[PDB]
């Protein structure tokens, strides 16, 4: 069961494309629609693969060789993905899959001569053949032949089941004859079905590297799982607090959540893990708050609480161990982050910036108490002042306030007009994040806000709209990075400002 994602050897993924009679042409567009989006995740785990790029049916036709060096680069495994058309098989209609999986056998025998049979080259590849069919096999003879001559070149053993996975899946179909090919064998309508599934037939339990902005994509999969870097903090408090893994011991937080005194050794930070429910808590070495953080700072000018570098570190007694359910997110301008966006290598943080913020309405995340993964607008640009000048309005926070620029400075990202969700006091800490091609990066921080959604309060999440009005600030983590590179230079590799 299920194909490995790890740091060791090689992953070998081929891709087989029904395009038989069988299959009708709308058919065939939503398996290339669901091996684009294969190709895009198995790429997205930073390990080395290569794709074979496969259409079938009376012969089999190779688009993409794992032979060619271009099956290791993205770009041109979708490329010659994009460009397979259903009517290259029209003077060819029957289903012949023995001949099919017969071709994947006739390039693995290919592959074997260019390595070397001895080589640790190619015995450390490991195997898997995706078929996107329906069955109705007709020509050809049985596939189960060129199964077994698969087996025989690759020596599967059940020390070796590791090395060898075939799937078949059907979208938009016979049941039983798909277990035969291949629980190995899928009935699937979506896209958005498969892009679930394919998420099931993946292992990475044995993928302890320290990678971050890796996630589940899946339901089904717990609250955790799609946000590994999640944690939870107390402080000598009870107020709770949230925050993000950056590494493998180290959590970014907001400084606003230690209100009580800089002694941490009545801290707790709460990681996920995989065996308990509750998760691993961890006990804290070392805290670096910033030094220019300062509710009452404004407190003369008639500001009661002013947010400005609202940051901190947290340094955890020992190292989380990397799993499904703990792993650090991406911090933007870091080598990490970079080779994550699939950049090139003479990347600046304003590169990252100009990237990752790209619109004037950029579609965040922050995740909520409950766990589950909420929706914000980021307002850059023009649409930023017209998102801060309504902080003009608050009087029970800000008196005597004419300047808006006191208060929310460009030091502060900013969300929560129209249909967003506001974080709660007890959210605030927790990363303000994007997804870009599946992997996750943290742009913000949680820090303050002019309605709290659990202030209801007893148990709720209230909005109201006759309220003037609802909006959220962020700590904008690009504007913090000379602070970021000082405590954390040895953690991560940072790149030219
Ligand atoms: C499926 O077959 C078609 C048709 O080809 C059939 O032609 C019959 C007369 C007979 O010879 C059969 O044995 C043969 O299967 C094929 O489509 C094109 O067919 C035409 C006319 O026969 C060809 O002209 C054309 O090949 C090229 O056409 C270009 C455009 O005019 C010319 O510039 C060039 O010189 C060359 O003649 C065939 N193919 C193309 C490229 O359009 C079709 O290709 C084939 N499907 C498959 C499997 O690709
Ligand atoms: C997304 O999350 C799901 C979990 O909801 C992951 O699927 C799970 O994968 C694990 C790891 O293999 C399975 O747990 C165990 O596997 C071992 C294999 O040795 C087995 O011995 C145990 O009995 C146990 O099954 C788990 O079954 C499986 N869960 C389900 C319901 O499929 C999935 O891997 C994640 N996907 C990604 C891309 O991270
Ligand atoms: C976790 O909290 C979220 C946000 O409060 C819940 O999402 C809401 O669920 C209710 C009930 O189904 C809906 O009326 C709202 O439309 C949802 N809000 C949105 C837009 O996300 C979520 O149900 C909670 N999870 C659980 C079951 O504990
Ligand atoms: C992946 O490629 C690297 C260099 O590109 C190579 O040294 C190594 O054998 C492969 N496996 C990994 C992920 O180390
Ligand atoms: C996850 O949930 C989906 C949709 O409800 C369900 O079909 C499936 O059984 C679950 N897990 C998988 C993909 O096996």
Same mark, same amino acid.
């Given at each position: 069961?299920?194909?490995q994602? $790890?740091?060791?050897?090689?992953?070998?993924?081929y891709?087989?494309?029904?395009?038989?009679?069988?299959?009708?042409e709308?058919?065939?567009?939503?398996?290339?629609?669901?091996?684009?989006?294969?190709?895009?995740?198995?790429?997205? %785990?930073?390990?080395?693969?290569?794709?074979?790029?496969?259409?079938?049916?009376?012969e089999p036709?190779?688009?993409?060789s794992?032979?060619?060096?271009?099956?290791?680069?993205?770009?041109?495994?979708?490329?010659?993905?994009?460009?397979?058309?259903?009517?290259?098989?029209?003077?060819?209609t029957?289903?012949? +899959?023995?001949?099919a999986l017969?071709?994947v056998?006739?390039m693995?025998?290919?592959?074997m001569?260019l390595?070397?049979?001895? +080589?640790?080259?190619?015995?450390?590849?490991?195997?898997?053949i995706?078929?996107?069919?329906?069955?109705?096999?007709?020509?050809?003879?049985?596939?189960?032949?060129?199964?077994?001559?698969?087996?025989?070149?690759?020596?599967?053993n059940?020390?070796?089941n590791?090395? !060898?996975?075939?799937?078949?899946?059907g979208?938009?179909?016979?049941?039983?004859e798909?277990?035969?090919?291949?629980?190995?064998a899928?009935?699937?309508?979506?896209?958005?079905? !498969?892009?679930?599934?394919?998420?099931?037939?993946?292992?990475?339990?044995?993928?302890?590297?320290?990678?971050?902005?890796?996630?589940?994509?899946?339901?089904n999969?717990?609250? $955790?799982?799609?946000?590994?870097?999640?944690?939870?903090?107390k402080?000598?408090? $009870?107020?709770?607090?949230?925050?993000?893994?950056?590494?493998?011991?180290?959590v970014?937080?907001?400084?606003?959540? %230690? #209100?009580?005194?800089?002694?941490?050794?009545?801290?707790?930070?709460?990681?996920?893990?995989?065996?308990?429910?509750?998760?691993?808590?961890?006990?804290?070495?070392?805290?670096?708050?910033?030094?220019?953080?300062?509710?009452?700072?404004?407190?003369n000018?008639?500001?009661?609480?002013?947010?400005?570098?609202?940051?901190?570190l947290?340094k955890?007694?020992?190292?989380?161990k990397?799993?499904?359910?703990?792993?650090?997110?991406?911090?933007?301008?870091?080598?990490?982050?970079?080779?994550?966006?699939? #950049?090139? $290598?003479?990347?600046?943080?304003?590169?990252?910036?100009?990237?990752?913020?790209?619109?004037?309405?950029?579609?965040?995340?922050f995740?909520? !108490?409950?766990?589950?993964?909420?929706?914000?607008?980021?307002?850059m640009?023009?649409?930023?002042?017209?998102? *801060?000048?309504?902080?003009?309005?608050?009087k029970?926070?800000?008196?005597?306030?004419?300047?808006?620029?006191?208060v929310? +400075?460009?030091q502060? !990202?900013?969300?929560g007009?129209?249909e967003?969700?506001?974080?709660?006091k007890?959210?605030?800490?927790?990363?303000?994040?994007?997804?870009?091609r599946?992997?996750?990066?943290?742009?913000?921080?949680?820090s303050?806000?002019?309605?709290?959604?659990?202030?209801?309060? *007893?148990?709720?999440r *209230?909005?109201?709209?006759?309220?003037?009005?609802? #909006?959220?600030?962020?700590?904008?983590? %690009?504007?913090?990075?000379?602070?970021?590179?000082?405590?954390?230079?040895?953690?991560?590799?940072?790149?030219?400002?």
């Open positions: 069961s299920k194909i994602i $790890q740091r060791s050897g090689h992953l070998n993924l891709l087989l494309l029904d395009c038989s009679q069988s299959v009708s709308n058919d065939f567009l939503i398996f290339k629609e669901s091996a684009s989006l294969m190709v895009d995740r198995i790429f997205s %785990f930073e390990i080395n693969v290569s794709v074979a790029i496969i259409t079938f049916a009376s036709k190779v688009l993409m794992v032979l060619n060096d271009n099956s290791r680069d993205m770009t041109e495994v979708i490329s010659s993905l994009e460009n397979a058309n259903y009517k290259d098989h029209e003077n060819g029957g289903t012949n +899959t023995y001949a017969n071709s056998y006739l693995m025998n290919n592959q001569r390595l070397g049979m001895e +080589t640790m080259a190619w015995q450390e590849i490991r195997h898997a995706i078929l996107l069919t329906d069955g109705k096999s007709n020509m050809g003879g049985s596939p189960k032949t060129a199964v077994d001559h698969i087996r025989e070149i690759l020596n599967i059940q020390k070796r590791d090395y !060898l996975d075939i799937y078949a899946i979208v938009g179909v016979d049941w039983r798909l277990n035969e090919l291949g629980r190995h899928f009935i699937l309508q979506d896209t958005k079905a !498969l892009h679930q599934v394919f998420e099931h037939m993946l292992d990475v339990s044995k993928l302890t590297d320290t990678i971050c902005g890796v996630g589940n994509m899946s339901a999969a717990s609250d $955790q799982e799609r946000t590994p870097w999640h944690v939870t903090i402080p000598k408090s $009870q107020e709770t607090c949230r925050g993000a893994l950056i590494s493998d011991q180290w970014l937080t907001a400084a606003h959540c %230690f #209100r009580d005194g800089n002694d941490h050794s009545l801290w707790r930070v709460n990681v996920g893990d995989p065996k308990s429910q509750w998760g691993k808590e961890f006990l804290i070495e070392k805290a670096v708050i910033s030094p220019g953080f300062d509710v009452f700072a404004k407190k000018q008639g500001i009661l609480e002013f947010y400005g570098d609202d940051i901190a947290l955890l007694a020992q190292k989380v990397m799993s499904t359910h703990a792993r650090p997110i991406c911090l933007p301008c870091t080598m990490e982050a970079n080779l994550a966006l699939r #950049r090139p $290598q003479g990347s600046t943080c304003r590169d990252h910036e100009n990237e990752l913020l790209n619109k004037q309405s950029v579609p965040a995340h995740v909520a !108490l409950n766990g589950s993964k909420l929706n914000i607008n980021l307002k640009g023009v649409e930023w002042t017209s998102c *801060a000048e309504v902080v003009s309005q608050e029970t926070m800000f008196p005597n306030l004419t300047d808006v620029r006191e929310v +400075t460009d502060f !990202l900013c969300s007009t129209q967003d969700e506001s974080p709660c007890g959210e605030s800490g927790g990363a303000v994040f994007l997804e870009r599946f992997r996750f990066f943290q742009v913000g921080l949680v303050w806000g002019l309605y709290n959604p659990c202030l209801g309060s *007893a148990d709720k *209230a909005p109201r709209s006759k309220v003037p009005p609802p #909006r959220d600030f962020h700590i904008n983590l %690009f504007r913090m990075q000379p602070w970021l590179r000082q405590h954390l230079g040895d953690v991560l590799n940072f790149l030219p400002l």
